[PDB]
Every structure is written in C-alpha cells, then in structure tokens.
C-alpha cells in the first residue's frame, strides 16, 4: 500500500510527531477503557433497592408486612462521528514550490499534504481536549454557536446531578471565602464505599495562583494548597491528592475521583484523528483530505464530581 | 500490528487504519508507565 | 406518561444512602402489601396508572375496559400496569389499599376523593385519607401517600 | 411521520411484481440523481422530511437548523434524515431536483401533470410565483392525510 | 491596506496554543464549508474585488472580458480567492450557492442581505442571508459570514 500510495506513506512517517492529548493526565490508567464503535450507543444496566415504610413489628397475628421494593436503570452513552477537510499541495507539485528554507505557496497558503496533515491534527486533538472537559464543541472564544449535539454525550464540567458552588462576586478574590465554598462542597460529596482512592484536583491558573500562598496573621510552612491537600486526605482515607492547573477552565475548580467504579472513560478506538482515504483530485496542484474522529464515551456516577464556579462580577 | 513496528507492512487502508488504532493505544500505554505526578 | 421512563438515563445512580429513595413513579404496589389481598388484571383504556379506574364499555364486539375515572364509577385503583400487554392491575375498592397515588394539582389527615380524572382531591362517598404531603415529581405530576378503604355513606 | 414505519410488520412482502413498487414513503433521495449533485446536512427542527426546509436561528447558544418552511425563506428541499443523529439532508436550491414530495391535502384530486407548484408556509407543495415545481404525475394517498407527487424543482422564477 | 496577505511584515512569533478565534482573518480565502462538486472559475481581475460581489466587465474588443467589484442587476458571480501574480481572481458563479466570509458595509443572524454597487453586502432582491454579526478587521474593513442562494425577489 505504501508503493502504491503516498498519502499512506506520508502518514505513518509523521505520526510520530503528533504530540499526546493532555486528557490523559486527568484520568487514572484503569479509567480509561477503548470500545470498538465509530457511531452508535451503548447501554447498561444497574438494579437498585429501597425501603418503602417503617419495619413491621412481629407481635401475635399480622398479614400486612412492609414492602421492599426495587428499581432499574439503563444508562445509554451516544457516540458521534465528526470529519473535517484541509487544503494541501499534489506530491508531483512539491518540487516547482521547494525553496531555499520552506516548501509551499507563502502567498495563497500551501503546504506540503505532510506538513497540512500535522497541523490538521494538532487542532483536532485540541478540539477534543476542550470538549472532555467541558462538554461542549465550539470555536468562539465567547462559546456560543455551539454545535447541537446528541443526548447522553456530557463531560466533567457540565454532567448533570452533581455537587455545584458559586462563589460571590465579591468575595472573587477573598480565599477564604473560596475555601469555605469547596468545603461545603466537599461535605456533601457520596463516595460511599469508594472512598479509599486517589483524587483529582483542576484549576485555572488564576485559582492555582492564589493557591500558593500562605495560609491564613499569616502562617508559616502552611500554603493554602496545602491545607486543602489535608481537607481531601480527611475524606479519601488519606490517599493522593493531585492538583492539575488547565488554561481552558475559567474560574472553575472541578474535583473527583480516580477510582474506574465511579467514573469511567470509555472512548471509541477512533476517537483520535485518522485520514480518509478519500482525495479529493483535479487538473491543478490543489489536493483536498479528509480526517476523522469519534466523540463521546464519559460515563460518572451521580453526586461523585465538586464543581466550584467563582463568579467574577 | 502496530505503526511503531517497522516490519509491519499494510496491505490495505482498512490494515493501516488498525495499527494507527494501536499505535495510538500504545502510546498512551506507554504515556501512563513513564508518567509520574507529583505529590504534594 | 410511563411507569418506566422512556428515555434511558444518562448517569449512573448513587446507592450508598438508604432515606427517602422510594419517592418514584416506578415504584409499583403499594408500602403494606397483605398476602390475603384479591388482585385483578384488565384491558387498559388510556394510562390510568396509579389512577382511579373505572369500567369502561365498548360497543359489545369486545370485552370491556378500565380507564381512569372517579365521583359515583369508581371500581378500584390501579397499582401497576404490564406495558407489553396492556394489562391494568386494579384492586377492587372493596378491598383496602394504602400508597402512592396521583393527586390533583394538603397536608397528613386530610379527607381526599377521586375526582373525574382518576386524580385525588381535596374535599364525600369515599373513604381516603392522606398520610404524607405532596411529593411533586414533575412540574404537573404530584403524588401523596393514601390509604383507601372502602366507600363512606351519603 | 417517520422515514420507517414505527409499527412492526405482521405479514412478509410479495417480491414478485415490479411495477408500481416505489410509491412508498421510505423512498429517500430522488428517482433521477447526477453523480455532481451538491449534498449538505443541518441540524432539524422536527421532521422536514420530503419537504422544503428553511433556516431557522435561535438565541445563538447553538448552531443555526433548519424547518419545514416555503415562501420567500426556502432555502432548499429535504431529501433524507438520519433519526439516531437528527441531520437533514438538504439539497440546495440552485441544484436542480426531481423526486417525490409532500403534497397539501387540500385539491390534491386536482392536481395533474404539468402543473405549477409552489411552497407553502409547511414546506408542503400546492398547486398555484416563486419557485420553479411541477408535478410530473397526480397525488399517491399512502395515509389518510398523507399525499406526495413526483415533481421537480429547477430554482427560483422571477 | 487590502491585499489578501498584508505587505508588512511581523515583529512577533506568533502564539500557536489557542484554538478559538483564529479564523476572522482577511487572509481566509474560500468558503468555511465547501463541496467537491463546486463549480469555480478564474477570470481577469479588474481593480481588487477580492471577497465582493463581481459583475462581467467588457472592454473594446481587443482584450477579453474581465471581472469588476460590483453587483445589483449584474451580478454574475463571488469571488473567494485572488491570485496577485497573475491577477487571476477565482469566481463561484451565482448559479452555485456559497458560504463563506464576505465584505459588509460599513446586522444580526436572519438578516437578508444584497450586493451593492461596490460588491459589498447591505443590509435589504434578496442574494444571501447573514449568519452572524458583522467582525471590524480596521476602520472601514468589516467582514460577515454570509451564505449565498441565489437571486430571489
């Protein structure tokens, strides 16, 4: 395929320079868990029990008992598939637009179909980054015109049933107002049984900031990070406690666990970028690819992630 | 069945397009082992 | 609409608490189930889940129905429904029931009655108390802890 | 209202004849197709199928979709949606199109071939200004309330 | 001041680490969504109609015909791209529809908008209908994203 295909060939030589989403750090290594699905769904089942009224006392004859009664549940996770298409240079093309330090068309915008496709890449593998954390697909730096996307398709910052703060606007640059929020946070959090687990911190660099320094007359050899890496040891059974600084949230702080039990990432085996072997071809030196890539697969349990919101004004 | 293997030789797109699927597999394998987060 | 809630859940439920997880619309029969109770099965005229049935007749060429209904019909009240078959389970008023049924959009020992839709009612020819307040679990659906027993005297 | 039947079927089809086999509502895409026909999808607003879709903006959270729609805001015809995505297919008014469509329930008996056709409000066709749509054969009831025609559209008229 | 590339050059590397916003630039030539199956020409450009509305321009008759900034009654045409060296200016005919980034008048979503004299969008024949709020890239350059559909009354 390679000998009869250059495209192909061009490929393998240069995926070795795409640089690894960073999501990767946000999830534990059993967390994360491929499926073979490019566009499609898939469905659990979980079974529940609950008590309906008080225990009935056995005292001579009685026929009316208290009820247990049961419930279930499927949980569905959508999966999408999205492609995009980039302009590039024919191979035969390349040698009438070679240079003396660069190979392309400075002044329509060309490239080499090599050079087109990493860079085509490394934007798609940041769409995706903004989406898992986020839970939405847009280019607007504002975030409107988002695209319409299907059910059952949510990220960590935007799942639905979990704990939520806001944080005043005018107590914004007020710590310990700030801690007071992510404690009453933290309080309300139900790991249950799955407690003994690493957990997760991540801030945006104006929170982590702020973080560093001292506790507070102010204390010595005490930062308020660290007095929040004891208040999380308090409920985890003193287990790590990792704090990662994102430049996409925005006065966020999202804090969850670790453990694969409560929330789990199932992503498809193509989720990351592939070529199409589709080419686009005409009489000029102007080619056209396609690349694609799967969406989805996030999956937590309920009132298990601390969503912390520090409304600015 | 990997692109990081350089005996592999893809038949097919459908082939190529599998050992990119590994190939990306392996490397977050790979990211995982040589991660290490600082505690603290 | 539906005893079990069409679209499929998005997120995994939290079971590590054991209060007030029984106030759903799926939760079928009733607190205090007597093993001596008399129990029957109809042809569903409608969705009178956990609804005031009443009889309800054809034009002859089939068997009759149950559909939601109260004032001077009542006949029972439904506890569950078998979608596939269309099947109503229905307690004959007869017999005493006591759990959660829908009530009309009240506090605990407050006379309650069927009104024209199978819903109960604030207050007559029925004998119904309310044990609990109001639960709402949608912005139009309401439910309330109840204890029928019996048709009261005019 | 749906590309497929919701109900099941109780019986096996006869695959026997072959004329007259084609007058079914799950007939997507159109009886004559060029292989340089222009081919877009969009988000739907409720179902356009077999019908003339407009653009339809929101409050600008999410990207613009498109709706059963005519008169002077057609922009195109749908002739396909994908139900588990929700995406219309929509082929462009400057493309030239020949298919079955959605036909109005009102006159319906009245319509003939070669006969002018123009869009209503409910991207539903009824028989006459500004668009080019004539019907190439008479209305086919496959429900009580449900009639499409063979017709095609060639753009906007002056 | 117009060119498609700015003539000036840059002080600064840029900052390759966003990817939001990086697209409302007056060098984004083409559409935003484009099809194999568009039909585009390249004609002798007459003036800098890059990114306007482009009428048929004729001549004595020694020379062939060429294209011009314009529109109204004799629009013929939208041109996406320019080439300098050859004055080469590519043209989608009206027949096409196209979507893309367009010269505005120095307007919300749902807007209908048609071509000037000057080949550049106004707010209302109707040819195209505005997609977003008009961008400022200087002083009297405003851009919009437009989709193109023809001519209607």
């Known amino acids: 395929l390679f000998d009869e295909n250059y495209y192909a060939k061009a490929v393998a030589n240069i995926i070795g320079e795409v640089k690894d989403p960073?999501?990767?750090?946000?999830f534990s290594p059993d967390q994360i868990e491929d499926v073979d699905l490019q566009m499609g769904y898939?469905?659990?089942?979980?079974?529940?029990?609950?008590?309906?009224?008080?225990?009935?006392?056995?005292?001579?004859?009685?026929?009316?008992?208290?009820?247990?009664?049961?419930?279930?549940?499927?949980?569905?996770?959508?999966?999408?598939?999205l492609?995009?298409?980039?302009?590039?240079?024919?191979?035969?093309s390349e040698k009438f637009y070679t240079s003396d330090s660069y190979i392309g068309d400075i002044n329509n915008n060309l490239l080499p179909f090599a050079q087109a496709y990493k860079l085509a890449s490394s934007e798609i593998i940041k769409l995706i980054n903004h989406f898992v954390l986020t839970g939405t697909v847009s280019i607007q730096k504002d975030?409107?015109?988002?695209?319409?996307?299907?059910?059952?398709?949510?990220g960590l910052l935007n799942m639905p049933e979990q704990i939520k703060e806001e944080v005043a606007s005018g107590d914004k640059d007020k710590m310990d107002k700030i801690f007071?929020?992510?404690?009453?946070?933290?309080?309300?959090?139900?790991?249950?049984?799955?407690?003994?687990?690493?957990?997760?911190?991540?801030?945006?660099?104006?929170?982590?900031?702020?973080?560093?320094?001292?506790?507070?007359?102010?204390?010595?050899?005490?930062?308020?990070?660290?007095?929040?890496?004891?208040?999380?040891?308090?409920?985890?059974?003193?287990?790590?406690?990792?704090?990662?600084?994102?430049?996409?949230?925005?006065?966020?702080?999202?804090?969850?666990?670790?453990?694969?039990?409560?929330?789990?990432?199932?992503?498809?085996?193509?989720?990351?970028?592939?070529?199409?072997?589709?080419?686009?071809?005409?009489?000029?030196?102007?080619?056209?690819?396609?690349?694609?890539?799967?969406?989805?697969?996030?999956?937590?349990?309920?009132?298990?992630?601390?969503?912390?919101?520090?409304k600015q004004s | 069945a990997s692109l990081l293997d350089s005996n592999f030789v893809p038949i097919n797109f459908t082939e190529f397009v599998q050992a990119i699927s590994n190939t990306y597999k392996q490397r977050r394998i790979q990211f995982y082992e040589n991660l290490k987060r600082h505690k603290r | 609409l539906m005893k079990n809630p069409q679209q499929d859940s998005g997120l995994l439920s939290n079971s590590i608490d054991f209060r007030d997880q029984n106030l759903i619309f799926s939760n079928s029969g009733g607190v205090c189930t007597s093993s001596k109770d008399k129990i029957e099965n109809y042809p569903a005229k409608g969705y009178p889940y956990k609804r005031g049935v009443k009889l309800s007749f054809g034009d002859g060429t089939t068997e009759l129905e149950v559909e939601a209904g109260g004032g001077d019909d009542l006949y029972g009240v439904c506890s569950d429904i078998d979608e596939?078959?269309?099947?109503?389970?229905?307690?004959?008023?007869?017999?005493?029931f006591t759990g959660y049924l829908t009530l009309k959009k009240v506090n605990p020992g407050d006379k309650l009655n069927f009104n024209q839709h199978g819903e109960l009612e604030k207050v007559k020819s029925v004998n119904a108390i309310a044990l609990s307040k109001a639960?709402?679990?949608?912005?139009?659906?309401?439910?309330?802890?109840?204890?029928?027993?019996?048709?009261?005297?005019?």
């Not at chain 1, 492609?83 to 240079?89: A, D, E, G, V």
């Open chain 1, 22 to 26: 960073i999501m990767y750090k946000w």
């Open chain 1, 42 to 81: 898939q469905k659990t089942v979980k079974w529940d029990a609950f008590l309906n009224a008080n225990p009935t006392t056995i005292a001579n004859e009685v026929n009316t008992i208290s009820t247990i009664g049961f419930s279930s549940e499927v949980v569905r996770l959508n999966y999408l598939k």
């Open chain 1, 83 to 92: 492609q995009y298409k980039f302009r590039h240079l024919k191979q035969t």
């Open chain 1, 143 to 154: 975030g409107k015109n988002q695209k319409r996307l299907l059910p059952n398709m949510y």
């Open chain 1, 180 to 310: 007071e929020k992510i404690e009453a946070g933290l309080s309300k959090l139900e790991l249950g049984d799955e407690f003994s687990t690493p957990m997760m911190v991540i801030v945006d660099p104006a929170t982590s900031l702020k973080l560093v320094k001292p506790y507070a007359a102010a204390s010595s050899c005490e930062k308020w990070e660290d007095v929040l890496i004891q208040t999380i040891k308090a409920i985890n059974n003193r287990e790590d406690v990792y704090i990662e600084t994102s430049n996409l949230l925005k006065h966020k702080i999202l804090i969850y666990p670790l453990n694969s039990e409560l929330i789990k990432f199932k992503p498809s085996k193509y989720m990351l970028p592939t070529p199409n072997e589709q080419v686009d071809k005409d009489s000029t030196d102007v080619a056209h690819s396609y690349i694609d890539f799967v969406l989805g697969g996030l999956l937590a349990t309920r009132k298990t992630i601390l969503q912390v919101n520090i």
């Open chain 3, 84 to 96: 596939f078959s269309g099947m109503a389970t229905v307690i004959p008023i007869t017999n005493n």
């Open chain 3, 135 to 154: 639960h709402k679990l949608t912005e139009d659906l309401f439910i309330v802890l109840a204890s029928v027993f019996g048709n009261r005297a005019i």
